[PDB]
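Consider the following assembly input.
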Amino acid sequence: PTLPFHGESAYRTDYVPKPLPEVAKPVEVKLPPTLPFNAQSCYRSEY
Amino acid sequence: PSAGASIQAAGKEIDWSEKKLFRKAVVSTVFASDQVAERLRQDLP
């Protein structure tokens, strides 16, 4: 009697549509806070 | 002739908006100062 066949292409077995990589690292960063101007001049302190 | 209900092929829309001189670029650690920024400024322990 006829038999079946376990035939696979070498391109089809290894290249199945892979699961998509999980998109990640949406990192957002904040700046250090600003600082006041706590300074004089020569003509504000000494006069 | 009523077989005209179809989404149009060759999908370009003609860009009416401003052209993208600046695309969103991931600015991260090496082009991120900190560190010496509070070492030159001593934000206290």
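The radius of gyration of chain A is 36 Å. Ask yourself how this observation constrains the way the partners meet.
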